[PDB]
Structure 1
Amino acid sequence: MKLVSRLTAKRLQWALVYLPMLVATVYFLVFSADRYVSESVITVRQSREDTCYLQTYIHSMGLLQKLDQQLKLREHFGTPLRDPLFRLWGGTSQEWFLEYYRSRVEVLMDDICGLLTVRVQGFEPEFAQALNRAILEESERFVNELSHRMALKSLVVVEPPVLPEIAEYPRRWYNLATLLVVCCLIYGVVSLVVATIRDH
């Protein structure tokens, strides 16, 4: 209780507002690395089961090994030495590689059309487009092989993968603004609670 009243205001102000924003601004404006995004929109036709299998297959492990053999994802993702958070550190485990890859490619599907959209992140736009194209080709080969193994069907590409011009995901200003909102709310709640415990 002696230290409970010692948090005062300025110490709480510093350690809950200004230091986190100092490190956040330092990381975003200097340490961060750009992450270009390639977006594609595909479906499977001769059938929600088929695009369900495809959605499971995109984030699978066998596809990850095939893509690592083809384009060497592990070598590419370890290049941004400046960013320590969003780079793939060398000598990491296979499971962490799978989790990192699943974070990098986002797969989405609308329920009222069955359209499956994929967004692939990469530190170079050409690599992102190549990864998206390889994903699409492997998906087409997979559904054709699954049809053939039983003994017909082809992928429809509504929107082929784009070649991005500028990166879009490491948004620095929007992240700083939502950090402002969250930090202020956390301050307000914890300051009210420290006031009522100190008054007791």
Structure 2
Amino acid sequence: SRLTAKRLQWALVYLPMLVATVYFLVFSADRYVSESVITVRQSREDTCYLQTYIHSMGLLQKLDQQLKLREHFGTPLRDPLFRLWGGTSQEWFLEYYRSRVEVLMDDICGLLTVRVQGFEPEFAQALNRAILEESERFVNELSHRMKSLVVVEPPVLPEIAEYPRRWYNLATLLVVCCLIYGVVSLVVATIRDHQ
């Protein structure tokens, strides 16, 4: 009946496509990533310590005091989904910082990989350098209070926006939308026939 006219494709295929394109090419803001690869040697225990500490709240407090992350992360007024709204809760800021700085651990070699996303190419490298330096200081102070940081690949200065992926996301969400359209159409035909 109502969910049987042609509008159903516009319900799932067309309008999500239109809103996705308007956001991705008109509203979105570039997010340059900077990648560094580090490790700790003198093994797994101290690397796990560092992996936990990088996402810790105290490091976020130090970085906010030193680079003013809260002011910078709210500079893109155009992007409505990826800006840090003023007056937001501290827990949301911690979640945002945890979502930006991506830390990956390799099983075989035990190499930490830090990918830091910033809205300015120099800012991402500066944040990566600050993270590496403060992590090294924490490893020294921690061990000394109770080791060194080996930087395999230093922070790099990006040139183009590795994120967000416009055409990639558009294509995969288009594929998902037609899959859901087919499933919903099959279900709707089943209800409309067995009634």
TM range (shorter): over 0.9
Aligned residues: 194
**Cα distance in structure 1, aligned partners of 2:5 and 2:98:** 43
Structure 1, residues 138-176: CA drift from partner, whole Å, max 9, x if none?
A: 0000000111111xx110000000000111111100000
Structure 2: where are the runs of 5+ without partners? none
- Using the TM superposition, give the Cα deviation of residue 80 of structure 1 relative to its aligned residue in structure 2, in angstroms: 0.2
Any gaps of 5 or more consecutive residues in structure 1? none
Residue 8 (structure 2) aligns with = 12
* Matched residue SS, 1:44: strand
User: Does 127-136 or 11-20 show the bigger shift?
Assistant: 11-20
TM-score normalized by structure 1?
0.96
Counting only pairs closer than 5 Å after superposition, residues 60-139 of structure 1 correspond to structure 2 as: 60-139=56-135
CA deviation profile, 1:48-85 (whole Å, cap 9, x unmatched): 00000000001110000000000000000000000010
> Aligned partners of 2:150 and 2:156: how far apart in 1?
16
Q: In structure 1, how many angstroms separate the alpha carbons of the residues matched to 2:14 and 2:181?
A: 12
User: 1:9: Cα distance to partner?
Assistant: 3.5
Structure 1 runs, 4 residues or longer, greater than 6 Å off: none
CA contact 2:4–2:188 (8 Å) conserved in 1: no
Q: Helix, strand or coil: the match of 2:18? A: helix
- Greater Cα offset, 11-20 or 132-141: 11-20
RMSD: 0.6
TM-score, structure 2 normalization = 0.98
The aligned residue for residue 33 of structure 2 is 37
Percent of residue pairs identical? 100
Q: Which residue of structure 2 lines up, in the alignment, with residue 183 of structure 1?
A: 177
User: Which residue, out of 154, 162, 181, partners 1:160?
Assistant: 154
